Ligand binder design. Sequence first.
Ligand SMILES: [Mg+2]
Ligand SMILES: [Mg+2]
Ligand SMILES: [Mg+2]
Ligand SMILES: [Mg+2]
Ligand SMILES: [Mg+2]
Ligand SMILES: [Mg+2]
Ligand SMILES: [Mg+2]
Lengths: 241, 231, 204, 250, 195, 196, 243, 244, 226
Amino acid sequence: GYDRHITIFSPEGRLYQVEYAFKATNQTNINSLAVRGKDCTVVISQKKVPDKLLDPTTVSYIFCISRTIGMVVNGPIPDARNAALRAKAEAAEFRYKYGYDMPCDVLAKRMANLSQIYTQRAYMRPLGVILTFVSVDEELGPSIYKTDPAGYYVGYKATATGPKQQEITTNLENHFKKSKIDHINEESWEKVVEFAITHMIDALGTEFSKNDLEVGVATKDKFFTLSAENIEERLVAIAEQ
Amino acid sequence: NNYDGDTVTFSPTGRLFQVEYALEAIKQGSVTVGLRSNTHAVLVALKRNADELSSYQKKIIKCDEHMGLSLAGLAPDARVLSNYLRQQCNYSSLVFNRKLAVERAGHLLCDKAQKNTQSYGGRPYGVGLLIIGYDKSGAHLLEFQPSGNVTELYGTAIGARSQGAKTYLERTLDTFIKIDGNPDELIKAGVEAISQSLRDESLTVDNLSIAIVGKDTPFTIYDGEAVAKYI
Amino acid sequence: SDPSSINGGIVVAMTGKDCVAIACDLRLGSQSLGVSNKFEKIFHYGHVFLGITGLATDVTTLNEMFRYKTNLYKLKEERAIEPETFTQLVSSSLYERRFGPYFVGPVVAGINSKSGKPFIAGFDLIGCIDEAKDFIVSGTASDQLFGMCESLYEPNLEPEDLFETISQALLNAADRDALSGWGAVVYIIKKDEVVKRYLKMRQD
Amino acid sequence: MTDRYSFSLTTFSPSGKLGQIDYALTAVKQGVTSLGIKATNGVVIATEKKSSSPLAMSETLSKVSLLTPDIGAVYSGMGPDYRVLVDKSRKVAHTSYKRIYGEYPPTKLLVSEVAKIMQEATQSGGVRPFGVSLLIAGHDEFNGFSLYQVDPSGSYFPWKATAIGKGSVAAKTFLEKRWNDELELEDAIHIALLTLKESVEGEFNGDTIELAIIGDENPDLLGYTGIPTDKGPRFRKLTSQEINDRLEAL
Amino acid sequence: MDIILGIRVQDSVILASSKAVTRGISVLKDSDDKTRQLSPHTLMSFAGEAGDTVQFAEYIQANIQLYSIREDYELSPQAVSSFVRQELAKSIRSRRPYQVNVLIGGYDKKKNKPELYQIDYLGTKVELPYGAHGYSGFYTFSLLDHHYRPDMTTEEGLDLLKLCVQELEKRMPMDFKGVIVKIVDKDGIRQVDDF
Amino acid sequence: TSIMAVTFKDGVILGADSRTTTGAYIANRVTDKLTRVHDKIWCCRSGSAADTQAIADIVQYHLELYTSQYGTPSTETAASVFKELCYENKDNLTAGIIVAGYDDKNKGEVYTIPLGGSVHKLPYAIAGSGSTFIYGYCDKNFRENMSKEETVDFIKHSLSQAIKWDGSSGGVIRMVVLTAAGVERLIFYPDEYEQL
Amino acid sequence: TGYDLSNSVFSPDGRNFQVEYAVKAVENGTTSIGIKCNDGVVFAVEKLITSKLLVPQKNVKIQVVDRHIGCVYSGLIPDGRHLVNRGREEAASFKKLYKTPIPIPAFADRLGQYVQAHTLYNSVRPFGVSTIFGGVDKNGAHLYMLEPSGSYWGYKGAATGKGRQSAKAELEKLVDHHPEGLSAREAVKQAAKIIYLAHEDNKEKDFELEISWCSLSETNGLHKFVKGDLLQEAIDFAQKEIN
Amino acid sequence: GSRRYDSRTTIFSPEGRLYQVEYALESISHAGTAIGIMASDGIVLAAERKVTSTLLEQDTSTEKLYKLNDKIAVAVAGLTADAEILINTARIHAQNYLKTYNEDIPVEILVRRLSDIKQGYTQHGGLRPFGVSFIYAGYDDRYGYQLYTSNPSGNYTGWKAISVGANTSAAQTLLQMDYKDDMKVDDAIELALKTLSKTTDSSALTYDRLEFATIRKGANDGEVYQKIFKPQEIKDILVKTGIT
Amino acid sequence: TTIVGVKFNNGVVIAADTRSTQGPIVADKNCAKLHRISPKIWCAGAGTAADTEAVTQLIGSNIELHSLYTSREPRVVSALQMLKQHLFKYQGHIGAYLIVAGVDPTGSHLFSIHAHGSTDVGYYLSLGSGSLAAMAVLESHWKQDLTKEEAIKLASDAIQAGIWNDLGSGSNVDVCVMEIGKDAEYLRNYLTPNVREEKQKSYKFPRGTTAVLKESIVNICDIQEE
Ligand SMILES: [Mg+2]
Ligand SMILES: [Mg+2]
Ligand SMILES: [Mg+2]
Ligand SMILES: [Mg+2]
Ligand SMILES: [Mg+2]
Ligand SMILES: [Mg+2]
Ligand SMILES: [Mg+2]
């Protein structure tokens, strides 16, 4: 039964350790969601601080990889930070070697290649995380690229990740079946964030306070995360409509 | 059981069996006692022969002028660890013109042992050590276990039936700690402590090993005729 | 002292109508001392011709190296290497020794077996390709060769006129160089026959 | 750390089977169908863009890849394994050929290098075989047009036409009926589309099919003018629109 | 060291090598044999830098003897000379090069021909009817150019050699203490012990 | 080369000429010697153009990676990274670098890193071949806590004199102003500064 | 099955059992705590007195990193020492390159990444310690706790070892009954109490209390051991509360 | 750690056999039959391709017969990818020898080096052996025309006639019967094809399922030529020897 | 050698003379010095000719691989950054001096790079032994907002100044024009101001003039069949 323990093929051509790494991805019981505006890319994630002894400002699964690229992770925090440190090193090295900022899709490919290696080389385990990279690319515009433990990656109009990803996904598909466009037709990122939160609320059937969410926003030339108070202002505008 | 094939494996209750098996080799070793006052520190060790044609295995090793140890378990592992100690004492003198604090020596041994408990291909050391020394903060006694645990003590014993001596020293603590400026009395008390671990055999002139270090006393080993005075 | 003029020697190549020629002297010396009058400096790998002047040990070494590489090339590709491709291979191989170079002046000559186009090229010791249409020269009498070739050469000579031109260019250049001469060979190269002619010349 | 798996993970079993290679071929069998057809004046390679979710932008996932200006590749099996092989194949076309000879390698030799890489993953320490079969199409001056299949073992074979993956047995049969030595490239494209329709479940259009050709030199894709002898890449990827144009006369 | 000469006649190769060994101010020896038998029908004479000459020659000899045992076959003189050349070419770009010049005289039993190869320390190889290293050629080549014929006998070769050594003894400033002469032919290698 | 950096009440200003020479030939007369290693940490370069560009690019890399992990670096930290490169590679480098940056806690700061790779925190710094001619002038005219406009004038008058006397210095005077307000590039042409 | 025999193997539920077994070794160790206060942090630990022969005050468990960070841990003591040695190398190299002493969040990730790395391969074993650490930097006080999986978060208060449940509950009370702050001096006393309260679950042996702290006002932002009078005082405060 | 997953490819069985070598030989026994026959005036190599398809491009295909240099060729039986690794190594060795000695490599020396490489994989390194058996056909001026085989153990032997791959027992018996020392190349050709015709698992033997080659002195005056047969030329020789 | 680069409205132009020398001797009268890093990134080199070619090919190769990997068209800053880090590493021992010009999705660019690894930006540049003659012309006639036609004229005039006044430069003018949103046009032998005049006399020899010892047919074919 040792084809179960290391990344070699089972008799049906499967990699069980990769499949079990996909299962670890939902250990945190968190859902996230990414959407594109005209000028921006928004990523939101549930924030759960179950212990009262925690400093909630340090509890986060959103990372600022470079000045332009943000990354949200679905999976255990140690593997998430391992991926985050690596992506930061890769993006900085890219800029040094090639003289321009690493595109979101290129970083996604690079991290997807690293993941592929762990599925082929026996001594390295796969990381039990799914990585969603966001930016406003200078050539391609608003961008979402997502990587998984199989080393698969692809670009997205919008996407969702976590235990309830299917509900959020179908909710998003239905909106785009309606609107018939690739993106949220909205000028300000504030309104794209409001769309994102609204559609998560409907799809999950739950209500959010300012401490139940985490929001990252990508614009031309910077990616940033919102404070609890910026999110509150978002929640307030949603309620009043 | 399924978890004792190497040092790199925890049991389901969080134990490291290879380390515990290394601890077991010490329990089989011949008894050795250590104790100290405020001025001197003494090692007493019962040496074990193979038969009546054979010599008695030496148990006490000098590390520096102000430091040395006794062993119980795998003797070649003691030779490796004591050699490492000699080097570290030596490094401290050559580079810093400073005698290595007995406490630092304990920390260095702990870290050396630990590396062999966390990586593949290694094995834990299979020896326990009692380290005495006199440094800038007085007399010291350390107990080293191959799990990497090092402990500073007034007195102790390790090896087969050390428990007897260990209780004796626990009773006598308040008396032997005050034996300042009288080396012979401190040894006597150590010889008395080690006698509580004897069954069948008794202390003879090629059986007994004593070492002492203190205020104005370099680490020195007494064997043979030189222990007659104490039997 | 200068490694590229210890042994002496010259090579010249020329293009004409549906043909190329490549010629060389036969001298090998140790400075003033003439050692051998049979040291040929032109080699061929299939239908591609390579002349090499300079330090003779490196001449020998490079011939053995390109024989090696063109033989493996043929086994893998299942066809003989062409002049344009070989030229790039020579350039690459020389530059790979950028900081400990072979002291040579190679010259490539051949006809592309597909297009029928005549081809020549020259290199410096470190791989720089000189791709002249008319003629390429190399060796210790290269200045003299540039002089002869520049005045004697005209385009589109027939094989047997080209022979006379390149022969006279080599001969009279060699006679004004102390370290060149002692015999000469001339290859006339057409798409399916190659002729090799040894010239009669003064032996001082 | 240090990689301490310095022993083979693929080994012969008592019956002479190399287990991991067979299991790699099984993974290829589950893969989406891809095929190639050789014509007198070109080669066509095609496959289905099976998108995982409709929110995925499937044009950002390239199943057919340029390896050199005159050589392209498609696959069946594990996509991520394919993606890294393409990166390595592109690099080896330069390091072990273009930097030496100043020209791109002929199809068979690049295939040979890819095959070697895949063979080594079948014998080297601490690795599993690649779980993909490749179809590599290309043109070069002295060999003309060619089509090769490369398998997990590193074995490669030249084909007139073939298919790999899911519905390969049926597709190969379909190709045996229609292939002849007088096909022009448009005829081969038409057959490729017909063949591919059988293994495709739902939507069958320019946005769900990926198709490329090795054909005529495209000087309009070169990016510069003024060197008569440089005439442009023979590899071209058909647009969504070009595919749909040919799906009417189908 | 100093003078080494070789001449290939009809059916044999003759190698002549000086006997003196000089350490600066004194002649340490006047009977030194500057040659090694590489195989039963191949002989190598050598001259160049102290220590390196003998180290190189013995290293070559060891390698050829190893080949002979492994294959139970004697390499042709041409093959031996190419091996030797490669080693010297390899050495010239080394950290510290062998400064050694050699002559290889062999009888090829397959082609039934004597063969003489001249190789200098750079790895410059040439096959010759007669050859020398250093300044030896400057004094002897004009005599060899005059008298040499490809159909000479062994005795005629030796006489032409005496004439060469006599010219060297007349015009060369160094006293090289005569030469040791060896002949390589179809029956192997022998020394001419009166010269 | 003439380069300088001056702290003032609202932050720091860097200044430089625009000439780079190959012997007596002016290879570039509009060089930019003021280089960005972080948003509000800039440096002036002197010595080997190859060395200082290489170092600057490496420091920009280190600080970009620092920022990703630990947030905005201090000016002191930037100088420390420069120093490490200059000190450990002193045998192979000819670099004289002035580092100037703005913090909100620390305000404007200036660090000079001369040839040997030592570091010196100063209220202002001058360097390059042309700096020798303005040691007297700068010492007499520099005050602490000048206004933006006084500081622009001090730098303009100083580099004007350096340019006048040093043949290796010349062209336009470039400046970079670093404050809480942001980052402002200034340029002054020969006709303005020559007649001061 | 057999998924639990090798580090870095995912089980079919997506778990690394060897890491979970490492936690068992931690849960079997002595109790250690950390309390974040207004301008600093306090660390305390229970040292079991195995015998009268242990020299009191002489087997120190709390460890300093650089000059501004304290670390305490429960589980396998040598694993904790190994982790602190690595921490010291990481702090030294940071200060070497960047001049400034390592920020606490930066330091936390350095330990985090190192501990996480020991869950990637079967050739190493996970760390058998949970580590509570922290100190004062230029952005204030920080308290972290780090598990064998490499997981860590910032805390208001934290506890690990055999008496972790008791101590947590005590920590939860302090957080609720002081929503505006707790002084460094208060926190020292409270730390003593909570250890004394947590010692219930290790009652067979009596113990020695050990405390340290870094406070911007009380210690100038440097890590110091609570010794002498101030220690005795906090011992008294604790003794009065268990009656 | 990693020891657990180590198959130990290089150990003796209790009987003193190398498991992996035995199992590699078992693999090879399912490969297409290859035959080599030596005459006084040349050598024939004939090999059967493993079942074809009508869409396989034959005229550009090479699965069995490989040129090592101008005087030496090999027939392959086993894993083709493994064979190509070894073939390229042998090609390089041949050129190294030519570069060093300025003489073409003697057939045995090339065969010994390749066999020594195969041997190494059975004694050290913990890697699986190459699943390949070779038949070497070549010429040199010492021993003239020579045939050798090598297998995954790295043992090699010389032959007048030999087969590898499928049905070697049957093939060897047939060659043992009809082979004669004074035999000429054109007879050896006929013998090889007849032997494959009888041992094949196919219904009949046709041009599209064969690779064929000869090494002949049949080249103007004392020199050797290799001839890898085109598909049309195999079709002609099948007719000429009356098999189709 | 004379080489120049000139920025204009919607792009950049580079030009070079065509003489390559061996000391004081002209080896090639019509050398092509304008090399391609990528389709729309071209460069020209002075200094050690093998180094400029080698370094151009190496970075051109890595640029192509980078472009394939990123699915983006190559940038001039990438060519620049890779060249300067390669050259800096070798401490000036690779004697490559280049003007690099190109257009990419980011715009039009013009850079010089020096053998030790320093780089410079500008609107007009020159390099080589004729660089001072060329720069005299560029400094006399260059203005902001040149049209494509004016830039080709200015650049070729700058090369001409090198051709006539620098002994190191000669023969013809080659030009390459890179306009934004268009294919780069490589204009080989854009100017031809130096045709060799016809000689006074034919030096064609009567056949049989040369004395010959031996003729043989060389076997260029492989081993014959049968
Ligand atoms: Mg793995
Ligand atoms: Mg002459
Ligand atoms: Mg003369
Ligand atoms: Mg002469
Ligand atoms: Mg010579
Ligand atoms: Mg000036
Ligand atoms: Mg430098």
